[PDB]
Design an enzyme around this catalytic site. Structure first.
Site, mmCIF file in Angstrom:
data_model
loop_
_atom_site.group_PDB
_atom_site.id
_atom_site.type_symbol
_atom_site.label_atom_id
_atom_site.label_comp_id
_atom_site.label_asym_id
_atom_site.label_seq_id
_atom_site.Cartn_x
_atom_site.Cartn_y
_atom_site.Cartn_z
ATOM 1 N N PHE A 78 -6.874 1.188 0.939
ATOM 2 C CA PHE A 78 -7.997 2.103 0.712
ATOM 3 C C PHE A 78 -7.445 3.507 0.476
ATOM 4 O O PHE A 78 -6.632 4.022 1.258
ATOM 5 C CB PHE A 78 -8.899 2.057 1.955
ATOM 6 C CG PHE A 78 -10.114 2.966 1.982
ATOM 7 C CD1 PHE A 78 -10.827 3.260 0.825
ATOM 8 C CD2 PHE A 78 -10.558 3.483 3.157
ATOM 9 C CE1 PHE A 78 -11.993 4.005 0.873
ATOM 10 C CE2 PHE A 78 -11.680 4.270 3.209
ATOM 11 C CZ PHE A 78 -12.389 4.530 2.061
ATOM 12 N N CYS A 79 -7.863 4.132 -0.614
ATOM 13 C CA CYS A 79 -7.497 5.514 -0.917
ATOM 14 C C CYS A 79 -5.961 5.606 -1.029
ATOM 15 O O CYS A 79 -5.371 4.740 -1.677
ATOM 16 C CB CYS A 79 -8.146 6.471 0.106
ATOM 17 S SG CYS A 79 -9.899 6.707 -0.121
ATOM 18 N N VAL A 80 -5.320 6.591 -0.400
ATOM 19 C CA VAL A 80 -3.862 6.676 -0.531
ATOM 20 C C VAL A 80 -3.190 5.416 0.044
ATOM 21 O O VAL A 80 -2.106 5.054 -0.359
ATOM 22 C CB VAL A 80 -3.263 7.955 0.090
ATOM 23 C CG1 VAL A 80 -3.348 7.975 1.593
ATOM 24 C CG2 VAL A 80 -1.813 8.102 -0.240
#
Lengths: 376, 378
Positions: free
Chosen positions: A117-119
């Site tokens: 998720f995300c970075v």
């Protein structure tokens, strides 16, 4: 007020592994049988993971444990001085791979499915390339949840990266350092007013509960992904001895983006798909709404909608034009994609951890409780 | 907990003029003498005006009244069905010009200084062109606060304008319509995560942000097409308003332009880019405030935090402007006041009454239009 682990972030489980970078949380089963093949969550290391475990009603981890998945989650350590030299490679080795090793040891399963998720998605992406090149078979599939591969259009962050500051840090890289959560929040915060519905106090709390990063890792991230867009060019970066080439990734991929996401533009996520040309399959699913409201859209309430389309044209507008809308949470679709890749049903484990990895402390653990370092 | 007019938006005054688009608010003096020449505030229309008048400590209106200015403020009507055919031109005529006529009539002064904030600044820019072309002298100076003229780099909004939808609305323009607050909030966003820090803040700002307005379809469609897509203001005569081909090089009064360094809504260099097009002006001033869109714009002198930067030179390259700038502690409002005051006439006794015989006070500030809530979902 909020007490993490008490009236927020309450999905039951145990820390079952700890090293200098992570605590690995194993969640207690809530079903009599489970899918045999474990599911590893790789949250971002900007802000705290618990956007994925807020209240029981909106908890992503709780939902997936309740669907029968053997969920393990990486809880990142907020950077402190002994971590000042940690690099992007450290996040692959001491983060993703250390986690995967512990999952293999505890479960006795040779492989797992992974979510980033995300970075955390970008870390996962790089980890996949390293693993493929070294013949390390940790993962049978990968899911990228609001994460970039092609960083050509990263959104408004492009205007606020100080290239001179990045270059200054590169000059003095070997000394390492700590990047403050305050600094990180000026460029990587992801909360918008439209995510607060209308607890929206939960989200306000989460947004202000910032964490620090090692200087080498953070500077590399800015230089290589945001400025150089290295992942779209094979061999532009080297990690863990491996020239990084996204076209080598060779497992099924699922990619989620949110239509109204102002943080990770959905078309920018979509743009990454064409680079994943070594995969046996790719699935792209578009959720309704904004970054947080769209991503963290639970099945308990099953509001909103998502779109699907098995054809992956180059033009995202063509993808959307051919897409079918479905009511409710995209989590349902992801579950349907994951389940056939998750093995047979087996009895739920009766214990957390293993003899070699005994339970250390109740979830949510100690690293998520850390407060960012004082101002310097 | 928030009651508009009672514990927010409490600067005392009266509505002194009302038409189908605006309430004009005149603020009660708080000084024995005032600068003679009035000051007109043309606020945002995509959100409610009261970002400019939140708590007393952070109120921009209250500060300027306290500095001796004769402040009048345009409170825009949230769009209802009787307004569904209103155009950009309506905002010039029934908004800016109607307000300026009322100011002239109440004060008996022939001109005023104007401030335009956000899209209010854009409306003001276009009004200045119309006025210049028709020989109407309403304004002696113009101030643009976080407002674009050159829209070439409008920031993230570019990604959230659906040209096909704009075009379908253009095809049905005669029928008019209403653009919901919800749609407006999906394309425009005044807040960022740093404005939402929590341990009133950030709840006053969230209330303001969520107190959404609706806009008339023709006005809003035109705004998207002509400014955000076509960038019409940079090209002489690319649009026509009120009979007049719009050419911003004709504007011929002193200009002051404010932008905020960390503004994510109006990139400061995008604001700066407009200056070179204002080539008919006798003077131009650019001032850069520290911090973001909200904290940098609404940075009060009462606390006098942060800083601002000045540089009399106006190179084409904004990085050159900043490299040659001088930092000054505190609020840019102080600098604006110093620029405005010599253009504001002599001191005269404070008026003893609000309005006039012809324009009696209608109701206390902040009035009725600001209290309207957005239309229900459809």
């Amino acid at each position: 007020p909020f007490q993490i682990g008490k009236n927020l972030v309450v999905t039951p489980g145990e820390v079952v592994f700890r090293n200098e970078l992570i605590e690995l949380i194993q969640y207690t089963p809530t079903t009599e049988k489970v899918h045999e093949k474990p599911l590893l969550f790789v949250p971002p290391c900007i802000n705290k993971y618990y956007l994925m475990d807020l209240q029981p009603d909106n908890s992503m981890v709780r939902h997936f444990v309740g669907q029968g998945y053997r969920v393990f989650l990486v809880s990142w350590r907020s950077a402190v001085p002994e971590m000042k030299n940690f690099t992007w490679e450290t996040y692959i080795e001491k983060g993703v791979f250390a986690a995967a090793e512990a999952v293999q040891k505890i479960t006795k399963q040779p492989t797992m499915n992974a979510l980033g998720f995300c970075v955390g998605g970008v870390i996962l992406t790089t980890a996949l390339c390293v693993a493929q090149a070294k013949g390390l078979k940790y993962f049978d599939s990968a899911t990228f949840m609001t994460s970039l591969i092609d960083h050509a259009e990263p959104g408004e962050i492009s205007f606020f990266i100080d290239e001179a500051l990045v270059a200054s840090r590169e000059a003095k890289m070997a000394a390492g350092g700590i990047i403050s959560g305050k600094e990180i929040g000026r460029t990587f915060a992801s909360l918008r007013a439209n995510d607060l519905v209308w607890a929206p106090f939960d989200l306000l709390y989460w947004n202000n509960d910032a964490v620090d990063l090692p200087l080498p890792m953070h500077t590399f991230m800015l230089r290589q992904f945001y400025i150089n867009n290295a992942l779209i060019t094979p061999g532009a970066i080297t990690l863990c001895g491996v020239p990084i080439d996204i076209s080598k990734i060779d497992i099924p991929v699922y990619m989620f983006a949110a239509r109204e996401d102002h943080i990770v533009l959905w078309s920018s996520a979509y743009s990454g798909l064409k680079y994943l040309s070594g995969t046996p399959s790719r699935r792209f699913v578009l959720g309704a709404s904004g970054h947080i409201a769209g991503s963290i859209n639970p099945v308990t309430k099953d509001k909103r909608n998502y779109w699907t389309n098995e054809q992956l044209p180059v033009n995202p507008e063509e993808w959307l034009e051919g897409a079918q809308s479905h009511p409710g949470s995209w989590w349902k679709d992801w579950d349907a994609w994951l389940a056939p890749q998750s093995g047979k049903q087996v009895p739920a484990p009766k214990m957390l951890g293993s003899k070699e990895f005994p339970p250390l402390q109740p979830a949510p653990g100690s690293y998520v409780l850390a407060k960012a370092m004082p101002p310097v």
